[PDB]
């Protein structure tokens, strides 16, 4: 009871140990001399030893499907202890790797959500909810809700806050999603939340008025989709941006063309119909703009901003279009559907 007592975290003769975690030692009443782990070809992980000798972790992932073998020595007053233990690590039936949007150190508009989109189908979503970890500055509360079986959406109950850090941690390596499956790596991103920009497209008015922190900066006469054709009312959140582009239904030269939904709404460049913006509804769906006014757009509106259509005689755009977040309303949102 006088020498060195040695503890791990993992047990003797463990099986299915998951690897999201790293392996410690501690000693007491005494310091830990060395430690080494090994894998059943007698490579060693890396790892490190604290200053005052008393608490070893590795540093490094351990593997799937790995035979692991811990040896520690510890030395105190009372003499020596030298422990050995082995131990067994997940093997998966299966790997997912995850997908993290937006961009690590984008600046995003008001609307983005944070998005996590898996190339497999997520048995257990609630392990995937987990094993993501979200911090924001200024904190704000805000919640999970899937978009499909593969993507993942997070955000707060109202747009973002201007000037707010979003980092975004996620930590699905050596986590069990289901049915065997588990994390193929970790991802990381960090984004920031820049200026509030709102655009309204009212077709009582046919005038999409773009605001920055809640004031006028342009009006743009429009039209928007005819009767048979119309622009679903709701919020989007903006896409994409591309300078020219070759609009397909089955999916018109548009230039300057701003995505909106990934149904196909973009706000473009439409000379065709300059005289009927601001008085008749025309198109297919899209916002149709003078080819100046949609230059305006691509150049200072940016992924994340909103664009509001109200009083169509279209219904209302799905809140899981993939753009169409908010349109579920929060109760309904923060439950989430993780079951």
Same mark, same amino acid.
């Given at each position: 009871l006088l020498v060195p007592k040695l503890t791990a975290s993992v047990t003797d003769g463990a099986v299915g140990v998951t690897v999201d975690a790293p392996v410690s030692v501690t000693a007491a009443?005494?310091?830990? +001399? +060395?430690?080494?782990?090994?894998?059943?070809?007698?490579?060693?992980?890396?790892?490190?030893?604290?200053?005052?000798?008393?608490?070893?972790?590795?540093?490094?992932?351990?593997?799937?499907?790995?035979?692991?073998?811990?040896?520690?020595?510890?030395?105190?007053l009372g003499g020596a202890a030298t422990r050995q233990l082995t131990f067994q690590t997940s093997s998966p039936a299966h790997l997912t790797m995850p997908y993290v949007m937006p961009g690590d150190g984008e600046v995003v508009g008001v609307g983005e959500p944070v998005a996590i989109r898996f190339d497999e189908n997520i048995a257990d979503r609630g392990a995937a *909810?987990?094993?993501?970890?979200?911090?924001?500055?200024?904190?704000? *509360?805000?919640a999970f809700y899937w978009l499909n079986n593969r993507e993942v959406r997070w955000r707060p109950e109202h747009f973002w806050k201007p000037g707010t850090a979003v980092d975004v941690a996620v930590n699905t390596y050596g986590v069990d999603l289901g049915e065997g499956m588990f994390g193929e790596d970790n991802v990381q991103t960090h984004f920031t939340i820049g200026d509030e920009v709102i655009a309204t497209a009212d077709d009582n008015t046919k005038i999409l008025t773009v605001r920055v922190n809640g004031e006028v900066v342009k009006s743009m006469p429009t039209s928007m989709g005819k009767?048979?054709?119309?622009?679903?009312?709701?919020?989007?959140?903006?896409?994409?941006?591309?300078?020219?582009?070759?609009?397909?239904?089955?999916?018109?030269?548009?230039?300057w063309a701003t995505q909106i939904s990934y149904s196909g709404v973009f706000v473009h460049s439409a000379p065709w119909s300059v005289g009927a913006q601001?008085?008749?509804?025309?198109?297919?769906?899209?916002?149709?703009?003078?080819?100046?006014? +949609?230059?305006?757009?691509?150049?200072?509106?940016?992924?994340?901003?909103?664009?509001?259509?109200?009083?169509?005689?279209?219904?209302?755009?799905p809140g899981i279009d993939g753009l169409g977040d908010w349109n579920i309303p929060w109760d309904q949102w923060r439950a989430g559907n993780a079951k």
């Amino acid at each position: 009871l006088l020498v060195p007592k040695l503890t791990a975290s993992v047990t003797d003769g463990a099986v299915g140990v998951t690897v999201d975690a790293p392996v410690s030692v501690t000693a007491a009443d005494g310091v830990l +001399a +060395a430690v080494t782990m090994v894998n059943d070809n007698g490579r060693p992980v890396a790892g490190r030893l604290s200053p005052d000798g008393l608490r070893w972790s590795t540093t490094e992932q351990l593997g799937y499907n790995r035979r692991y073998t811990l040896n520690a020595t510890a030395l105190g007053l009372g003499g020596a202890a030298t422990r050995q233990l082995t131990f067994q690590t997940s093997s998966p039936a299966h790997l997912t790797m995850p997908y993290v949007m937006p961009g690590d150190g984008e600046v995003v508009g008001v609307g983005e959500p944070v998005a996590i989109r898996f190339d497999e189908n997520i048995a257990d979503r609630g392990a995937a *909810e987990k094993a993501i970890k979200i911090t924001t500055n200024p904190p704000v *509360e805000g919640a999970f809700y899937w978009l499909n079986n593969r993507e993942v959406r997070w955000r707060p109950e109202h747009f973002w806050k201007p000037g707010t850090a979003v980092d975004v941690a996620v930590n699905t390596y050596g986590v069990d999603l289901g049915e065997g499956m588990f994390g193929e790596d970790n991802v990381q991103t960090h984004f920031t939340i820049g200026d509030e920009v709102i655009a309204t497209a009212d077709d009582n008015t046919k005038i999409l008025t773009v605001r920055v922190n809640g004031e006028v900066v342009k009006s743009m006469p429009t039209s928007m989709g005819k009767d048979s054709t119309p622009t679903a009312n709701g919020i989007y959140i903006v896409g994409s941006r591309y300078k020219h582009i070759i609009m397909d239904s089955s999916t018109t030269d548009v230039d300057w063309a701003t995505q909106i939904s990934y149904s196909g709404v973009f706000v473009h460049s439409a000379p065709w119909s300059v005289g009927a913006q601001g008085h008749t509804n025309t198109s297919h769906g899209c916002l149709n703009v003078s080819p100046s006014n +949609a230059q305006w757009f691509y150049d200072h509106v940016k992924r994340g901003d909103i664009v509001e259509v109200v009083n169509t005689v279209g219904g209302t755009l799905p809140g899981i279009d993939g753009l169409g977040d908010w349109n579920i309303p929060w109760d309904q949102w923060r439950a989430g559907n993780a079951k």
